[PDB]
Amino acid sequence: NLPTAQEVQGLMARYIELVDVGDIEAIVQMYADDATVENPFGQPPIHGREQIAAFYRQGLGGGKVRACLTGPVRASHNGCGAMPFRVEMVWNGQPCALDVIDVMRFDEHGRIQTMQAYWSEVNLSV
Amino acid sequence: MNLPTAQEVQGLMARYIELVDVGDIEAIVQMYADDATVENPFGQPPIHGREQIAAFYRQGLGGGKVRACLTGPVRASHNGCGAMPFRVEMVWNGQPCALDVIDVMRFDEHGRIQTMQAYWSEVNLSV
């Protein structure tokens, strides 16, 4: 149900695994039907499964991207957590890396209810 | 300072880690907005205002046998917020501990910390 701290750690790790593999369908299924994404944080949220699906489609379509944790998942006891990771992608034929922290809140079904992704240009490397 | 740019967020949040590391409680309190809110660890009830925040940091840092260092770059946004990964090192009973933490901060339009959430639990502790 509402994930323990240890379960949050596994779920957020699984999320990164799915991003790395690039399975958009599997990612969207991790989300609650009324979830919101703020990515990057500071931008208007997106709501609902198809909008989130379209977001990840644009972002991860179709290969092109690698992602891995760059430190442990930090987990709370209220079904939330935060994780550091790096996204690798080739942009304009030039390899790029982005350092990101995702903050997630899970619901009582172990689904992602909210996600905030912290990053900006200062976190992009060529 | 006004609302911090992304670069300014990076600098402010790194400075905060430096102050925790030296244990300068008054300098930390001065980085905070006068009516700021701390949630540490996130999930616990919030503490409000510089007096309470001072008391909280003094209980953890008064001794100063605490070390803190970034374990990755500060992630910064364009709306005066950011997040950073770090490790706190401590000695419980001559038993050296390490705690992995991520802090999320929102700064106000004066460059002061308005809210902070610290993400961690015992699964992030190593004794």
Swiss-Prot record, chain A:
Changing W91A: Slightly reduces activity. Reduces protein stability. Induction: By steroids. GO terms for molecular function: steroid Delta-isomerase activity. SUPFAM superfamilies: NTF2-like. GO terms for biological process: steroid metabolic process. Changing Y56S: Reduces activity 100-fold. It is an enzyme of class 5 (isomerase). CDD domains: ketosteroid_isomerase (cd00781). It catalyses: a 3-oxo-Delta(5)-steroid = a 3-oxo-Delta(4)-steroid. Keywords: Isomerase, Lipid metabolism, Steroid metabolism. Coiled coil: none annotated. Homodimer. Its EC number is 5.3.3.1. Gene3D superfamilies: 3.10.450.50. Substrate binds at D102. The active site is at Y15 (proton donor), N39 (proton acceptor). Changing Y15S: Reduces activity 20-fold. It comes from Pseudomonas putida. It holds the Pfam family SnoaL_2. This is Steroid Delta-isomerase. Changing D102 to A/L: Reduces activity 100-fold. Reduces activity 10000-fold.
